[PDB]
Each structure stands twice: as structure tokens, then as C-alpha cells.
Paper text:
One of the most recently discovered examples is the Vibrio export monitoring polypeptide ([name]) that allows [name] to adapt to changes in salinity by modulating expression of components of the protein targeting machinery. The switch between SecDF1 and SecDF2 is facilitated by the stalling activity of [name]. Ribosome stalling dissolves the stem-loop structure within the [name], exposes the RBS and thereby induces expression of Na+-independent SecDF2.
Since we observed a contribution of the amino acids in [name] beyond the initially identified stalling window and to ensure the maximum ribosome stalling efficiency, the wildtype [name] sequence lacking only the signal sequence (residues 26–159, ΔSS-[name]), rather than a shorter stalling window, was used. The [name] adopts an extremely compacted conformation within the exit tunnel comprising two α-helices, located in the upper and lower regions of the tunnel, connected by an α-turn and loop. The α-helix located in the upper region of the tunnel is comprised of the C-terminal 10 residues (N147–Q156) of [name] and is directly linked to the P-tRNA and thereby located directly in the peptidyltransferase center (PTC) of the ribosome. The linker between the two α-helices is located within the constriction of the exit tunnel, adjacent to ribosomal proteins uL4 and uL22. Structurally, the extensive compaction and secondary structure formation of [name] results in an unprecedented total of 37 residues being housed within the upper two thirds (approximately 50–55 Å) of the ribosomal exit tunnel, which contrasts with the 21–33 aa that were visualized within the exit tunnel for other stalling peptides, such as SecM, MifM, TnaC and CMV. Comparison of the conformation of nucleotides at the PTC of the [name]-stalled ribosomes revealed two nucleotides of the [name], U2585 and U2506, which adopt conformations incompatible with peptide bond formation.
Author numbering:
A (entry chain p): 1 to 46
B (entry chain g): 1 to 93
C (entry chain s): 120 to 156
D (entry chain P): 2 to 272
RNA sequence: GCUCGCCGGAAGACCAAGGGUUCCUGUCCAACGUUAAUCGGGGCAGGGUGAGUCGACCCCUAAGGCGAGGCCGAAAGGCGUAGUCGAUGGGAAACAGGUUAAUAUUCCUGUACUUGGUGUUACUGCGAAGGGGGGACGGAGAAGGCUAUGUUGGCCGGGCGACGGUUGUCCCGGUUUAAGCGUGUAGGCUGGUUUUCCAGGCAAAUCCGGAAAAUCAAGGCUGAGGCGUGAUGACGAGGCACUACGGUGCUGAAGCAACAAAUGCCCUGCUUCCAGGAAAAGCCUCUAAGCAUCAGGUAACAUCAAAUCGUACCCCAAACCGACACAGGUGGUCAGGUAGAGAAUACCAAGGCGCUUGAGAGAACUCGGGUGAAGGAACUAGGCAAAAUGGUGCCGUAACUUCGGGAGAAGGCACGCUGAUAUGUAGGUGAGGUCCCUCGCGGAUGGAGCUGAAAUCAGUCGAAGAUACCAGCUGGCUGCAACUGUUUAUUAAAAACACAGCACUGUGCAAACACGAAAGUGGACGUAUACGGUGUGACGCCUGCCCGGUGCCGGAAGGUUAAU
RNA sequence: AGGACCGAACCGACUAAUGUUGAAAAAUUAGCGGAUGACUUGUGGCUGGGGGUGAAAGGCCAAUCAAACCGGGAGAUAGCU
């Protein structure tokens, strides 16, 4: 059956990637919480 | 021209294997590990000027590093670059 | 194995399915309730 | 020429076509075409603002000359063409100085026919000229509402506007609505009536024909739940309410004009 | 290794996405593998991915994103002009053969092609975020010409055969060759050329558009395939010499023709139909400012450059998405034989597999199937399930009907094999020869050869000739819904939703209406034959009475009536 | 010609049986509907929570939907167990 995760790298990055978190106020606050929690990978880039 | 300070840092090791060996003893090509940011003009110039031979053409691939592990600790090795340097008819090394 | 066992015990903790008991177990409880009314 | 299709396969049983042998079978004139991307009924916020729109055939826009600015230069009608963006047909015309333009095609106008815009134009159908020079009681289409702006009244097929008065700097116009409106008399207008009247006689026949003009289905309000439409719910068919829009405003009677700026120009509302 | 079975429009082959070393070799069997394991997609180590031509990057753009200024907004921020990004689309160029354990249009051999830089030489008006062309583009249908590919004959090499026969109307195998370059064909489109003039293409224009003449009747554009060359080369069934028996080298015959033939190519064509079918760059042209014995343009030759990243391997799956080595999901490409209308179906080729627990026994019972005396719905909520029907041709076919249907109504008959008509016909294709020449990829004649239905008559076999697989059960009365469609992903596919059609009502354009503190945007580059809302729901005959209540529309006299 | 007819791919999901600590958190097998269209599909884009989208089922919005998920107010409150 066709499950929910149908992967695509270009949609992974355009959607949840770094240049797209940095592109706005609230994604920069996301990166700030991931750095402050101290996190090995911030976004999902590769 | 390429400066000689750049041109010394490019070639890194001769690559020893059996594909390399049959490339030397069968098709004049010496195979050698180069700098990761080394272009084909740099490798050609560096073999022209550091082994004093005449290079016909260079073919460069980039080899991806293998994820090994020690114990239960993984790690990728490291990517390197391998240059197939096709020499002319007059060569030794 | 321990991590997979904790997550695979954590599978039906937030479910919704009402005809299946506990999210997964097949039954006849629809007919039992419906016949009780 | 309207044509009833023979009833092979339902779907064709009720179709009436409006065929026109004088339309150009071929490609339109290219440098008066441009891209016309379809929207889906959705504004710059992405949201559906006008419902029921979407799909349909790909269409290219045709720059139709509504202004009719080339004054005094005659133009022969080169051909007539199908325009997908309108109810009427468009005539491709060729001015004497070698410029082609598309105009709305009036009623009698065929290929090889002289039209002429401007003040000293002859009064005959196809000639755009200001309404202080048109006689009272003449059918007139493609009417401007502000001088220099372009035609906006009576553009849709089979539609005309009658000039009934010339009191001063204004002309009283019986719009196709039935409404009497004052327009400034310097506003150009094209003589005759616009010419595909039989457009209204076609009957479409099946559901997919509506679909291919870009008209998605219309779910009626009473078939929904109360969360969706004010008509909603009720255990079989159940209306019981005064009929409203999906936003609660009364349909079936309730007047929704509020302008106050253009009420000066309305002599009598429609009836 | 020999047999046996399974897939073969896939369970073969090649990719994209996705993964990321799973690829290949050596080595180990702890754990992983639903068993054992010497094996493995497991552990460990080593190896492996070679590009001017493939793809990305790059040039150009769609939807859409972002957006200097800007308009707007308590702040955050919204929208958006110039612009700038964004492929799933447009834009230069390589093919055959060989090779590795593992890469190959990348390496090697042979033969090519493309775009830029620079230099020389000959001629020369060049020049844009500007003008024009072009790129540039729908659905369906129909043939015609081809090819891939296949079949048969010829040729060449080999065999004459475990059991009757098999020197022949016999058996097995091979019969392959590309890009590029040259020619220009079956088609398809368009009249061509010269001169003058002009309110158009923001300016200019020799370009485009337009208006006059004059002359010629042809020119041009495009185009599959074939043919020639590439190629006296490669490949080639097989033999020969050594053989770490794994193979390794050497040598190597024929290498043709006929017919059939695509869903591929001519074809972005042609015919037709409404529902009227991207953009921008490369490309070709025109000039403006400027530069004008310079620069630049064109042509030939030479020379240099073409960087960077991807390239392993799986990819309908044990490697991706499904927690699993999960009976599920996953886009594109190639598509042989026989029978067949066919990409169905049966059996097969190439190729790949036998599904990572086995050995027995042959109880009840469960599951998947086969058959069944007599009866034949008596079962049951209900013919649920099963059984039955099932092909092609011809005959024949009712009520009712919107004249289309109903209709494949219903119901029948024929069907294999052999021989003759006819040493294979009708038809298709069509050589050599002959005739003419505007002479060749020509047309006329001619029929050799190949292919080849279908029908009748005669005979013969079986219980049965649509023999397997595949492949309608039919009829009568009636409710609802007109019809095709849509819907409760995961107990409801329906009479429900939709629908064409009808009506009412709003709406005069800065439209009503909707999203939006606003700007703005959709409505719509539309304009009342249009658009929005509401109900009803093809079609036919129709749609009666009630305005007291609630709503809406209209009226303005009087009563009451806020801020002030 | 056709929201035409029969029928594969392709899309679907009408019936039955199995399965129901499944091979599978919705499938398999045998039949079944559509199959040139209101079709189907790939790649990208847009719409967002009292909001979207809806041929309307209160359906769908990441195995979640009469108001998603995450985090916080938050140790809500619980005359009840």
C-alpha cells in the first residue's frame, strides 16, 4: 500500500532545509532552538 | 602558468593496485592519488614538471570514503581523487 | 534490539481505531454494543 | 445555424451546436496572441475566492482593440475568427498602412468589408465614433464609459445598446440590462450590434461540456452539513430557512448595490 | 555436472526517483539469516566508479517563489514593479568493435563530429537590456511510403545419426556490420523574381507588414528510407597450438535474396473537429546611438581549449516506501517464436529462477480443488456460493421507443483432417527481359519467383472438430434515479452527490461576491447572450389556490426613536 | 463521430471465501466496474487549523480529524475512581 513517506531530496531540502529555515523569522527561531538544545544536525541537509 | 608552490601540493601518492599495474604495463597510464581540489590542468602540469615526462591526457575520478567502524563507533573515511595520467610514447616513470 | 523493542512497544499508544480493540485486535464488539442498546 | 445532434449515445441526445462556416479554420494571427494562464478561482493568497472554476481547455489571449484609436484610416476586414475568451467572434482587420488588429465582430460584418474609426466616419455598422456624432435611437455596441478608456458596455454576443437621448454633455443609454445610464458624449462607440446572437441557443448536452469550459460542479447548499452552509442538515431534505448565500446574506431578493459614487449616472435601475 | 519444474508484456534487460558501497576479490562463522551453513546484501581487509559528445552544472523560461525602490500594515510583517531564481519544458556535438573479477557511447582500436579563443590570408559596412521572422507546440481519424524485426529460400560449415527408417522434397548452426560523409527519393508545404511608393512594427530600417506595376512559369523549403562510402577493416560458425583445465593465443568459410511487417520513422505532416490548443533564449535577419582607411563581420587554413561534479551496485526490489531478507506500493524504456484479432491466453527462446526449515505418515477437522447415482432451489433472509453460457460466419429476431435503439434480443445451422476445383485459387508483392526518353532512386509492358485467404464438391477419423487455455447465462413484471460519472482512504457505491436543462434573484464594472486590519488579488485582461448566489434536476404533459405569520422589495404621510 | 460498444495495460473496488496473536495496522484468490475521457499518471508548485479543500461523506489535511501535529499556559480542573 502506498505509505505516507514518498521521499524526494529536492522537496526535503526546499521544504525543511537550511536555506528555507533561514529564509524567515520563525525558521531562524527553529535553528536557534536546535542550536541551543545543542544538536548534532540542525536541519536536514545531507 | 601554474605557480610551482601550487603545483607541488597536487600530486600525493602513486596508486598501487592491479588496475594501475595493468594500466602502466599495458596502456602507458600511471595512476596516482591527487589533491582533492586538483584540476586536470594542474595534474598534467605537475607531472610534466615534477616527473619530467610528457603527458598526453589526464582522466580524474573521485573515490568516496568507506564507512568503517571500530568496535561500535562508525566513521566514514575520506574522499580522495585518483588521476589516470596517460603519458606519450616516450616515458619511463 | 532494546531501542527497537521500546519503540515497538510504543506503536499503539496514540491510536484512534474503534472497531479494533486497542487499535489492532479484531473483535465483534460493534455487534455486542449495538445489540445491547 | 444551430444544429441538433442526432441522438447516438446519450450525451449527444440533447446537444445543439452553433456552427459557423465563415469562421477561420486555422491558426490565429500570432503577434496579437499572448499567454493567458488559468487561475482556478484563486487569488494571490492561494484561496478559492470565486468558486466553481477550474480545469477546462488551454486558451491563448487575443489582444482585441477595444479602444479603436486609429482614426480616419480605413480598414478592410481580413477574416473572422473564433475567440475563446469571449461569447462573440473577433474580426481580424487590416488597416491601409499595414497594421492588423482584432476587433469585436458586429452583426452583419463579413470578410472584405470597410470599417473606419474616427469623428468623420460614415454611419454604418462597424464604425467606431464618438456618441455626440451618432444619431439618437441607434443600436451601438462596445460603448466607452469614460472617454479614451476602452469599450466596456455591450461586448458580449448578440448585445447592443440603444442611444435614447443627447441632453448636453451626456447621452442617455438604454443598457441591455434595461437600465438607463448617462455616459459622457465624448465616449466612442461602435455602430451596429455585436454578432454571434445564436450563441444563446446552444445547449451543451452533457456534464463534461461544462467541464471543458472550466466550470467545476456546484454542490447545493441543502446537501451539506450545517457546518458547511447555512442550509445544512436535517434528516431527509429539510429546508426550513430563508435562502441565503454561503456566507449568510439573503439570496432571492436582497439588493446588494452600494456605490453612491456612480448613482449620479443612473437614470433608472433595471426591471 | 546431468536431469526435472517455474516466469518469459516477466519472476528477462536498461534506467529515473530513492538508497548509499549493498559492487568485485580474499578471508571468518560469534551475532544477523525464522533451520544447518563451508554460504550471504553478515564480520574484517584490499580493490573498484576514467567523458569536449551521456547526465548535471550552463544559456532560456512555465506554474510559482523571492523581491531594490514602492504601496500597505500596532511591531513582527503582507503585496508587488524593475529584476532575480525556478524544469517536469526549449538550447552544440560519437558511433561500431574489443577489453576488466569488478567501469565504460568514459579505457583501447578504427572512423567521426561540435562549439569557442588566438594567429595568418582574401573580401568586407559592423553595431543593441530595440523591430521582424523563427523557436511555437490541441483532440481524433485516415491511409500511403518505409524501417526495426521476423519467416522462408540460396550460400557456407558441420552431421548421416543408441530403436524401424533417414544421400535427401533430410538434420543442426551461421548468414552481422554503426555513427559520420556523398547523393537526393516516396511524400508535405509554398507561386517565384525585379522595380517603385507608404498614416504601420514607440525612433530608424535595405528586415517585416502593406499598395501598385512588369515578367517568368518555375524556383525554393522540408523530408523517412534506399543507394554509395565508412568497410580490401571489424565481427563471424567453427578448427589449430599450448593448456596453472579456469581457459589462453593463432586462424577463420558464407556473410545474399524474396516475402511479411509495427503501437517506431516520414509526421511538429494530412484530413477533420470544437473544447480553439505554453513562454523565453539559442538561431536567422533589420537597423538606432556610435565606429567608419581602426574596430568588427564573412570565408579558408593552422593552432589551442572544452573546466567542474555524477558515473560502482539494486532499481516492480532481500538494496527504495511498508518496524522484517514483509504474498503490499513504486514512473519511464526494449519487447523474439508458434497458435491468436491481440501487449489477452497456452507453450517456448534470450535470460532468470525453484520462493533460507526439512524428513515422514496419509486420522478427525479446516483451507484450495476434481467427480458424482436419482432428484433439481426442495437450501436459504435471499439461487449466497457453485454449475451453466461463452468464438467466427450466415440465417433470424418481439413489445416498447426520444426512431438512435431494444439487439449479441430471443433461437438456430456450419466448423477438424485430406484431396480436387487450383502439381495452392482470388488477392498482395513483383525480378530478368522488352519500349521510350525531359536518362534515372524514371515511367509503360511483362509476368518468373515469393506470399496467400475464403468458398464449394468429394472423402476420412473420433463419443466429441469454437475440442486445451481463453471466452455473454437468457427471458418476463416492477420501485428509484434520466443517462457517463462522484462519494464515506480502512464495515455504507446507493435511491445519496454531480449533471445537462429549467427558474428565481443579485450584479452597469472601481460590478455583485470572496480572500485580505490594509495594500492588493480572484471574479476577468470578462461586461448583462456576462458573472455570482439559491433551488429543481434529461425529455414529455404540466406546475392549481393562499400575501394572515416569517422574510424580501417598495413607499413616504403620521406615531415612537440615538449621538448632538 | 461518440462523457459510443466488447476487452488487456492502466484506474478502481461490487460479491464471496480465506486472513482476522494476518504474508498485510485493509490484503490474497476467484469472479467484478470504467477503460478517448467529467480519464489516468510522473515531476514541480499553491491553499493551514475554526483555517484549507470538499461532484458533500463531517470526507480528507502524513496509519491522527464534529476542529491536525508539536511545544507552552500546565502540576488546568476533577464535589469522581
Amino acid at each position: 500500500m502506498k505509505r505516507t513517506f514518498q521521499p524526494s531530496v529536492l522537496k526535503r531540502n526546499r521544504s525543511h532545509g537550511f536555506r528555507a529555515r533561514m529564509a524567515t523569522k520563525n525558521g531562524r527561531q527553529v535553528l536557534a532552538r536546535r542550536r541551543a538544545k545543542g544538536r548534532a544536525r540542525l536541519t536536514v541537509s545531507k | 602558468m601554474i605557480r610551482e608552490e601550487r603545483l607541488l601540493k597536487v600530486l600525493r601518492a602513486p596508486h598501487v593496485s592491479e588496475k594501475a599495474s595493468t594500466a602502466m604495463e599495458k596502456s602507458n597510464t600511471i595512476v596516482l592519488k591527487v589533491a582533492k581540489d586538483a584540476t586536470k590542468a594542474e595534474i598534467k602540469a605537475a607531472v610534466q614538471k615534477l616527473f619530467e615526462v610528457e603527458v598526453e591526457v589526464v582522466n580524474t575520478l573521485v573515490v568516496k570514503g568507506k564507512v568503517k567502524r571500530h568496535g561500535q563507533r562508525i566513521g566514514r573515511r575520506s574522499d580522495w581523487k585518483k588521476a589516470y595520467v596517460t603519458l606519450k610514447e616516450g616515458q619511463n616513470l | 534490539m532494546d531501542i527497537n523493542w521500546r519503540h515497538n512497544q510504543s506503536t499503539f499508544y496514540h491510536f484512534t481505531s474503534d472497531h479494533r480493540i486497542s487499535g489492532w485486535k479484531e473483535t465483534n464488539a460493534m455487534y455486542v454494543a449495538l445489540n445491547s442498546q | 445555424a444551430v444544429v441538433k445532434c442526432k441522438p447516438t449515445s446519450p450525451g449527444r441526445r440533447h446537444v445543439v451546436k452553433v456552427v459557423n462556416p465563415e469562421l477561420h479554420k486555422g491558426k490565429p494571427f500570432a503577434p496579437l496572441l499572448e499567454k493567458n494562464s488559468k487561475s482556478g478561482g484563486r487569488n494571490n493568497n492561494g484561496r478559492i475566492t470565486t468558486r466553481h472554476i477550474g480545469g477546462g481547455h488551454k486558451q491563448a489571449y487575443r489582444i482585441v482593440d477595444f479602444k479603436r484609436n486609429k482614426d480616419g484610416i480605413p480598414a478592410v476586414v481580413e477574416r473572422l475568427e473564433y475567440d475563446p475568451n469571449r461569447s462573440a467572434n473577433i474580426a481580424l482587420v487590416l488597416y491601409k498602412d499595414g497594421e492588423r488588429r482584432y476587433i469585436l465582430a458586429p452583426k452583419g460584418l463579413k470578410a472584405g468589408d470597410q470599417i473606419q474609426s474616427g469623428v468623420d466616419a460614415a454611419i454604418k455598422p462597424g464604425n467606431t465614433l464618438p456618441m455626440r456624432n451618432i444619431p439618437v435611437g441607434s443600436t451601438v455596441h462596445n460603448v466607452e464609459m469614460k472617454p479614451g478608456k476602452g469599450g466596456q458596455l455591450a461586448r458580449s454576443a448578440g448585445t447592443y445598446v440603444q442611444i435614447v437621448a443627447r441632453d448636453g454633455a451626456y447621452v442617455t443609454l438604454r443598457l441591455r440590462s434595461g437600465e438607463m445610464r448617462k455616459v459622457e458624449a465624448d465616449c466612442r462607440a461602435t455602430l451596429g450590434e455585436v454578432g454571434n446572437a445564436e450563441h444563446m441557443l446552444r445547449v451543451l448536452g452533457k456534464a463534461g461540456a461544462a467541464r471543458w469550459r472550466g466550470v467545476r460542479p456546484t454542490v447545493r447548499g441543502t446537501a451539506m452539513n450545517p457546518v458547511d452552509h447555512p442550509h445544512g442538515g436535517g434528516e431527509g431534505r429539510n429546508f426550513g430557512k430563508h435562502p441565503v448565500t454561503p456566507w449568510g446574506v439573503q439570496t432571492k431578493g436582497k439588493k446588494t448595490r452600494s456605490n453612491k459614487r456612480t448613482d449620479k449616472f443612473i437614470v433608472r435601475r433595471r426591471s
